[PDB]
């Protein structure tokens, strides 16, 4: 797996024509508060390509 290239799958906002996301936040997947901690309903925007 070449895990050098990634893709922001985890994001709620749709992007505007030519927009570049580069943030490293904890994607909240629901109402469960993430509070800067990775886990259930708390994943990460980027998804490494296999």
């Amino acid at each position, epitope marked *: *797996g070449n895990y050098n290239y990634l893709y922001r799958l985890f994001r709620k906002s749709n992007l505007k024509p030519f927009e570049r996301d580069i943030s490293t936040e904890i994607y909240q997947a*629901g109402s469960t508060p993430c509070n800067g901690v990775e886990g259930f*309903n708390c994943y990460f925007p980027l998804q490494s390509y*296999g």
Partner: antibody
Amino acid sequence: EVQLVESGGGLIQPGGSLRLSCAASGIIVSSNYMTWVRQAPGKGLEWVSVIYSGGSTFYADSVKGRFTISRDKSKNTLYLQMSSLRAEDTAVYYCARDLGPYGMDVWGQGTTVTVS
Amino acid sequence: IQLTQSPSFLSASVGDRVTITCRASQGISSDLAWYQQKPGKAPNLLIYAASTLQSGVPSRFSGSGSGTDFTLTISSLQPEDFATYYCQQLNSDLYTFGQGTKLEIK
């Protein structure tokens, strides 16, 4: 804690109209990938639709032109516009939450839809 | 893409080592999710990303394979370990499943 509850299916004449509902507790529907999944009697699971967290929609080849997926942010609920119903639409449908590399982590109980 | 499980009807007694195979026709190498379904029930994740143990799944369930080959391995059977076992294409557009393998506590 994370529960999906479904209603709206039932015995409906072929080609008729119908709608499903899928209330969600815990998960916000308006920011997660929700999919419709079908299971015909004596058959396995099969995909129907997905509406993206941004609001973009998707349906299967056997679904395009017939069904529509719809949502509500006030009630945190997922809907499926059921229309032009043929005999092959007789199945049980569940609502599941799509996370890409993570599998369908939560599921619904399912509702039986019969065509006659 | 086409996913084929092999073989469909499977039988073993308690304690046997089982190897349920879902064979990828093209080769995707990380996109598998193992779906166990009690007869007439709601499926559940078993192994996601084809090798990692999904949380709350008991440690008797294992997955292996990458690329074109993929397998489900159960180290020690239980009388309740009968179900219909699905494989799914992750990171896809149609989310293609397999036909389904019905393990039987026989």
